[PDB]
Design a protein around this ligand. Structure first.
Ligand code: JD2
Ligand code: JD2
Lengths: 216, 205
């Protein structure tokens, strides 16, 4: 019913859409609080360094464990579920979203560059629950867009937070009944509601075969 | 060179975005009525609402050409994958139609498909409240591939070599390129079996 989400990122402005997506009613009811933190608050040096070269060589850079360690020490508690987006993560699915929707405290650690030194998650996992997850089979530049997806998918399952109320869903239609030469399937206007449900089931079967045969 | 037009009833949500131009359009600009209505109840019943085809048709008429790739996020879409991102990275013009409510009248995509290429896609197996976050994901994955810009990655490390009593794997400090390459390959394949066995052709957990 109530959840705190802390997001840590070197691009705090990226997370502005979700703070805007929150209805005042939910905030006022104390049902939800989303806070965004600039990782550079926890840097050690005048240059506010968050990255360094990879051990073993290779392209790109790795985010520093000492900076992240300090950030997570301050923000996390023993009750925290630490969420770490990564293209190498376990798949984030609707099952995940449902599970996380009843958590009291999510912390989302958004990486950039080539990711975060693995000891950050490994150390954190010795005192809290840690979940390395991926939102899909494509590569992003960092975790912020993944955080937006995760926050939306989770919070829409928490009663009253975002203001909203297997096989693939089939097509939907509304007025007008005819538009640019295309008519709404007459069965939908038939008043035969058992037949409509059967029609929708077959549309779902066809669409699932065409687009996601793996689900069958 | 690529142009991306995004159409949405929440242009503010697209704020997180010279070889590429991204323009964001408020769908309600193409309404005529005072209440600027973009949604109506579904034919055949069901919870929620459906976006009207009329408003969308007018918006897309103005923004699209026959050369346009029309992208429509939907939980019922074909999977958007890295292959898709590579394919779209060489397009001149993407238009991303972001829905809300329970989605968009199917005739919008069907009508558009008579004039241009249309792709209904899903970014993953979870449900969002609308297409805007999916648009941000798609734009990021595509733009990083535009000219002039398998297996799971194993763990990465940087300085210091010992932290909180946790050591960087000694092989990575050894300077032995062959041993490091081998270790990284093993770590990758080990992570893949554990987290995404489907990528190697095994059953999902
Ligand atoms: N979830 C998720 C993700 C991400 C993601 C998440 C976090 C980071 C932090 C840095 N990068 C860039 C990067 C590029 C190459 C290799 C490693 N890392 C991220 C990418 N990409 N695709 C997903 N489904
Ligand atoms: N890509 C992608 C998506 C979406 C997505 C995309 C566009 C819309 C427009 C409205 N909704 C809400 C909604 C809820 C229930 C049934 C239908 N529609 C969207 C959801 N959800 N999950 C994905 N991987």
């Amino acid at each position: 019913g109530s959840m705190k989400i802390d997001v840590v990122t070197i691009f705090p402005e990226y997370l502005q859409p979700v703070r805007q997506s929150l209805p005042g009613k939910a905030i006022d009811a104390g049902l939800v609080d989303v806070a965004v933190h600039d990782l550079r608050r926890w840097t050690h040096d005048v240059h506010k360094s968050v990255d360094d070269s990879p051990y073993g060589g290779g392209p790109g850079m790795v985010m520093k464990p000492t900076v992240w360690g300090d950030a997570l020490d301050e923000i996390c508690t023993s009750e925290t579920l630490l969420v770490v987006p990564t293209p190498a993560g376990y798949p984030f699915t609707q099952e995940t979203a449902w599970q996380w929707s009843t958590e009291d405290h999510l912390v989302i650690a958004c990486g950039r560059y080539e990711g975060i030194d693995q000891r950050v998650a490994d150390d954190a996992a010795t005192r809290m629950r840690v979940r390395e997850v991926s939102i899909g089979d494509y590569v992003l530049n960092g975790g912020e867009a993944a955080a937006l997806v995760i926050i939306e998918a989770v919070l829409r399952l928490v009663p009253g937070v975002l203001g909203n109320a297997s096989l693939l869903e089939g097509p939907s239609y509304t007025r007008p009944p005819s538009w640019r030469g295309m008519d709404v399937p007459p069965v939908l206007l038939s008043g035969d509601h058992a037949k409509i449900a059967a029609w929708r089931a077959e549309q779902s079967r066809q669409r699932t075969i065409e687009r996601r045969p793996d689900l069958l």
